Every structure is written in C-alpha cells, then in structure tokens.
Design a protein around this ligand. Structure first.
Ligand SMILES: Cc1cc(C)nc(-n2c(=O)c3c(C)c([C@H](O)C4[C@H](O)CCC[C@H]4O)ccc3n(C)c2=O)n1
Ligand SMILES: Cc1cc(C)nc(-n2c(=O)c3c(C)c([C@H](O)C4[C@H](O)CCC[C@H]4O)ccc3n(C)c2=O)n1
Ligand SMILES: [Co+2]
Ligand SMILES: [Co+2]
Lengths: 382, 382
C-alpha cells in the first residue's frame, strides 16, 4: 500500500553535505576512494570569506564537503552582506557539530518543487525550523528543518550550476574519476527511540511507511514515487552482542545519520575499483561472509545470478537479498572516519521494471538471518 | 662559524604531529599523496578511549595524525588512569587548536639523549613549559615546551616501536607505498616578530644561527651537527605585493608552522609520483617557473646538472639554488588544507660530502631574485 500522502511535491535526493574540520582533505580522500569528480567550489578563491565548500559528483550523486574559516575573515559581515554561498551556514553551529559528532552528515538535501512552500507546510505540520527559505540570485531557494539529532532535511528548488556563488572546477583540477556510482539510494538515521522519530518526520512530510534479535528495530519512510527513502533505526537492548545502534549513539553523542547507500550501475566494477584503493587512501570494507554464505546463494537467487556471477559476489564480499519484487546486491564499508559511526553502503538492484521502482528488493533485512546461519554453518564445518 | 652551543644533546628530527578534526581522513590523504606507509596506530582498537592517532612513515620521516574522540568515552578517567598513549594530549587544547588554526602542526618532535634533562635545562633557560617529562612503560620519555604560537617543541628519548601503547599496523592495511621521501630536512615557523622569536628559542636550546624586498625576513637556528634546522620568518610590511607571511598570520590566527621540507633520495621520482596523483587525492604544486628560469640554470648550475637533468627540472617545475658549499633542488606544494597556511617543500641536496653536512646549499633564498628576474625576462620576451 502506497497512500501517496506527501504534503508537498518532492523530486529526488539532491545532495549530501558533510560538515568537516578540513573540507580539502576529506573531499580529496572521498574523491579517490569513491571515484567522484571535483565538480564545483565555493571558497576564498571564489570570494567566500566564511566557509570552504567543495562538491564531488558521480552521475547524479552529489557530496558536498564544508568547513569554516577563521571567523576573523568575515567579522565585519552581517547576513545582509554575507559572502557565504550557503546562507544557513554558521561558524558556531559547524564547530559545535563537528566537536560533538566528528565527521558526518549535516544535511540530507532533496530537490522539491518549491522550497518556500515545502518549508512552510513542513513547519505548519510539526517540523522544527532550522533555516528559513532564502532565495539565491533569484534562481535557487534553500530552506532547512530538523530531521534527527543535528541532521537537517534541506529543501532546494530551482526556477530553471549547483548553487549560485559556486564556480565550476577547472579541468586540470577535475580528474574524470568514475567507478560506476550513479545516485543516492537511501539515507539512514540512528535514533534512541524509533516511534517518536517516525511520527515526527512522517508528520511533517507526509512520507509513508515503505513496505518491507540482531540489535535494532527499523522502518522506512518514502515519498510518493518512493525514490526518496529514509530508513530510521533504533537500538534493541539486552541482547547477547551489544547493539551496533547503541554503540553509534554513544560514539556520535546521540542521534545522527548512520549510512548512505549509493546505487552503482555496475556493483562489480565499483567494488573492484574501491577495493584496489582501500589501502592506498580509499575505503575499507567489512569482513566478507564465509564461503557457506555463497554456497547458500544458489538456492536463494540461482534463478537471478549465474554461477560465475555468484562467484564474483564471493570474490568481492557482496551480500545478496531478495524481496517478493526484486533482488538486492549490497556491501558495507568500515566507518568513514575516526569514530565507529557513519559508513557507506554500495548497492545495486535487480527487477521491478515498469524505469525501476524505488527500493526494489528491500534493504537487506533478510541478510541478518542469512549471515548468522551461514556463520554458524561455517563454524560447524570447521 | 658553528659555536656548537647546544645546552643538551640533540640527535635528529623524530616526528611531526598534526592536530586534526578527523585523523583517519587526513592520514589517508597524506599517505596516498606523499607515498607514506601506515606504520602504527593508537585508537579505540588498541584501548585508547581518548584520541585517535595514526603514524605514517617514509624512510626516517614520521608524520603523526591525531584527533580527539568524544570526551564522554573517557569521562571517568584521570591522568593516573588514562588510556591516552600520548599523555600531553588534552581534548580541550586539541579542539581549541584546530578551531583556531585549522589543520596544522601541533608538535615538532626531536629525539634527544634525555628528555627529562632537555626539558629541565630548556625551562631553566627560558622555555615556557607545556607538558612535563613523562616516562612511558619505563622505556620512552616525552616532554614539551612552547616553540611559537600553539606549536610545541617535543623532546623524546629512548632507553634502548614508535611509542608504548602504539600497535604496529596489520600488513593488509599497510600498503608499502614509497615515492622516495626519506627524512625531514627542516621545519619553518612564521611569527609576527623575528627578533624575539629567535632570542627565545636560541635562548633555551643553545641552537646557533646557521650561516646563509620579497615580503619576509628570516633566520635559521641549528643544533650542534646542524641536522636539526629550524628557520623562522617574519613579515615585511608596506611592499608592493602583500607579504605571504602576513597572509599566513591572518588566516592561521597568529604564529605557527609554515612549511615542512622533506628530503627525497630522488627528487625526480618523488615529483613524478606526486604530480601523477595531484588531481586524484594527492597534493598540488605551485605554478612552475617560466622557461627563462630554466634557460638561466645553464649559467648557474651547468657544472652540477646536465642538460637532460635541467630539462627534467623544467618538466617537473623544480627550483634550483646554490651555496658556496652545495646545490639545492626544491619545490613547494599548494597549501595542504583549506587555509592558505601550511604547505610542504620537497628537497634534495648535492654536495658537502665529508655523509652530507646538514643544510648543504642553503634554503633557496637565491631563488627570490632568480624567480623575479626570470619572470621579468619572460614577460619582456612575450
Ligand atoms: C559488521 C555488522 C555488524 C552489525 C551489528 N550489523 C551489520 N549489518 C548491517 O549493519 C546491515 C545494514 C546496515 C543493512 C541496511 O543497509 C539498513 C537499511 O538501509 C535500512 C533497514 C535496516 C538497516 O540495517 C542491512 C543489513 C545489515 N546486515 C545484514 C548486517 O549484518 N554488520
Ligand atoms: C608562490 C610563492 C609566493 C611567495 C610570496 N613566495 C614564494 N616563495 C617561497 O615561499 C619560498 C620559500 C618558502 C623558501 C624556503 O623554503 C624557506 C626556507 O626554508 C627558510 C628560509 C626562507 C624561506 O622562504 C625559499 C624560497 C622561496 N621562494 C623563492 C619563493 O618564491 N612562493
Ligand atoms: Co541500507
Ligand atoms: Co624551506
């Protein structure tokens, strides 16, 4: 069931903004590790005395990395005279976020039909305002409401190239890296209590519940065409192994974004390229499932994947799940930074052709049982 | 003249510590960009609840990257019960340093015969104490005094593997990168007033002055065998072009470390490898001198470098200077992070064979005039 109850017209995920201590070093690391090109900038060289912001892109995926300069460079400015290209930016909010949470996602940005109306309707329906609608160069409108913790849901709408005040990046600095990642599939929050978090967010968006012992409860909120997908997790206490959601909350100092799932047009090539770079500046992946997991794939998805394609999943540590509608290939990175908090998921979906409907195959919930069983079978085998 | 007036026995540069917002991302970026291997760690996986510290090495060059965790993880600790592996670390000092200065060098560490005696003699001779001598596992002693700004001169001495509490890094995480960098040649501070800075540092070390219109005055302090080299710069005001030292002080919020000069055993190979990676996660270099500069090298160092070796300098943007004792090959990176503050110099020295004496060829002061003249000649040519 999809009641299509969005209270305002939502299009697609637009970008993700990380708040950083040094945007240059995080952006260069992510660019090499994920195969994302340097696409735009707003910094001292573009007249921005307030913050350094660098945009990486791969297909439709947009990762923004932002850090504050010394407040002294902009001390004579006021908001009417600001040189910041992102008017919601605040030195104090950014420093406090990073000191509290470490490196992580400040903004989950979605493109909407009209950011001013989305902001008003959201707030009229319970959203806590964070930054009011601001029109940039009579061209782009941006507004922000609280999502969970210190993460904001950012609305952006365009009259008709990222944002005014950003400059497109010089070719020599723009190496055309590409490992096959094409768009953001979903963005996942960890919270202490799932119920109130869902009620808040579904309350002000109209997003509906998407139909779907290991330490979490989770549910997924979705827009009308189910292309904006926002899962939310809560911990389950008193288990044998401590909940990874609770470990997140402790190290993150509370709720925040847990993982970003990036859709690849070729998850085999993406993982080959990412794994080649894991130990030379890139990202590391979680430990691979045992061979028993891959023997069990024949019975589960042997009608979807060939023996060679299953063996390729085994070589790359790829996990596989399946819905009543489709099939899911997924893998998780180790944490992106110092703290055991945010990580990345790489994903590719098979099925649900109509274009492919959003969330085809689910989110991998079936792999909690399949991993456990396969680990037990492997332990008993040896 | 070398009076050999060190007040305590100094050996060599030991390491450089960067204070970071996220140590993981800076260390991975530096590793790929400079060809430095992941050598040791002290973090949550080693029992450190206080800070994440990662060590990169190339030859004798040691770069340490350190960031604080949430204070809540260590809130029940006291200094007698600390899990920090670096006892001078303080969450508040680190957060304040980074918020004030951005990414940069907190500690210039030198290996001494006895860190407790070096600390006592330094303080008895005017050094401002920063962290008292602390003996780690009855094996290593560490102590810190202020150098300039918020940069400390760290003393380390060994009874007889980086520091106790650090673990050597697993092979799979340790990719054996190497672009030829072998040791730290010198470390340079920017200060508002050179005179008092020199008098302070030379006062408590006994380091002597090393014998050597463009916006700076500078002088170099050196240990007895002149293998520890600490240049210090001050701005010169009222010039045509604004002093780069003054721009540093403004963006850094005061004095701090300006550049680290890394000696390569093969500066041609180092620059080839670094430039291949500039736009895929590595470091960018300053704009190359005009061809007139390289035509002028024949008259200056044609007895030192062949035509092919001069043409190789031209291909790589390498600068060349010469002493009465030796010849200097050098090049500078763009700033390492968001702010136009710290950068890196790659260097290789020819001559002064006895081993090679420290500082052979000077520090490139002759290239201020040579660059200007060659730019004027190139402008007139076109
Ligand atoms: C090393 C380690 C330690 C622990 C405690 N769990 C794991 N782990 C996962 O984190 C994991 C995740 C994050 C997902 C989804 O992506 C999420 C969806 O987007 C939203 C719905 C629920 C979310 O879980 C799916 C399966 C997972 N499976 C099987 C798993 O085993 N891995
Ligand atoms: C783009 C740009 C803009 C400006 C204002 N200056 C430059 N520049 C330099 O920064 C530069 C530096 C940093 C050095 C040494 O390494 C230092 C020694 O270690 C200590 C003694 C003095 C120190 O200068 C040598 C020559 C330099 N030359 C010729 C130059 O032109 N480059
Ligand atoms: Co997921
Ligand atoms: Co130098």
């Amino acid at each position: 069931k999809n009641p299509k109850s969005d209270k305002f017209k939502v299009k697609r995920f637009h970008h993700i903004e990380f708040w950083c201590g040094d945007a240059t070093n995080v952006a260069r690391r992510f660019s090499w590790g994920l195969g994302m090109r340097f696409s735009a900038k707003s910094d001292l060289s573009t007249g921005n005395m307030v913050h350094a912001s660098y945009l990486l892109t791969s297909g439709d995926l947009r990762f923004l990395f932002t850090a504050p300069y010394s407040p002294s460079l902009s001390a004579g400015e006021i908001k009417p005279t600001t040189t910041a290209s992102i008017p919601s930016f605040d030195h104090g909010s950014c420093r406090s976020f990073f000191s509290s949470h470490g490196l992580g996602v400040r903004a989950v940005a979605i493109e909407v039909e009209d950011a001013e109306s989305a902001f008003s309707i959201s707030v009229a329906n319970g959203a806590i305002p964070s930054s009011p609608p601001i029109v940039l160069n009579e061209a782009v409108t941006i507004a922000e409401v609280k999502l969970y913790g210190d993460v904001v849901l950012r609305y952006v709408s365009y009259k008709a190239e990222f944002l005014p005040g950003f400059e497109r990046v010089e070719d020599a600095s723009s190496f055309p890296l590409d490992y096959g990642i094409r768009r953001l599939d979903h963005a996942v929050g960890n919270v202490p209590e799932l119920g109130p978090a869902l009620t808040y967010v579904a309350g002000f968006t109209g997003f509906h519940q998407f139909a779907e012992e290991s330490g979490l409860n989770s549910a997924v909120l979705a827009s009308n065409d189910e292309m904006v997908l926002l899962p939310i997790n809560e911990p389950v206490h008193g288990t044998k192994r401590k909940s990874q959601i609770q470990t997140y909350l402790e190290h993150n100092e509370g709720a925040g974004l847990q993982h970003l799932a990036l859709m690849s047009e070729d998850i085999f090539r993406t993982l080959r390229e990412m794994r080649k770079r894991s130990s030379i500046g890139g990202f590391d992946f979680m430990p691979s499932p045992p061979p028993t997991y891959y023997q069990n794939l024949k019975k589960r998805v042997g009608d979807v994947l060939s023996d060679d394609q299953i063996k390729e999943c085994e070589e790359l540590g790829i996990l596989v799940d399946r819905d009543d509608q489709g099939t899911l290939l997924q893998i998780f990175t180790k944490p992106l930074g110092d703290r055991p908090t945010i990580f990345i998921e790489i994903i590719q979906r098979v099925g649900c052709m109509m274009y492919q409907s959003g969330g085809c195959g689910g989110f991998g919930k079936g792999n909690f049982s399949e991993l456990f069983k396969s680990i037990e079978e492997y332990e008993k085998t040896l």
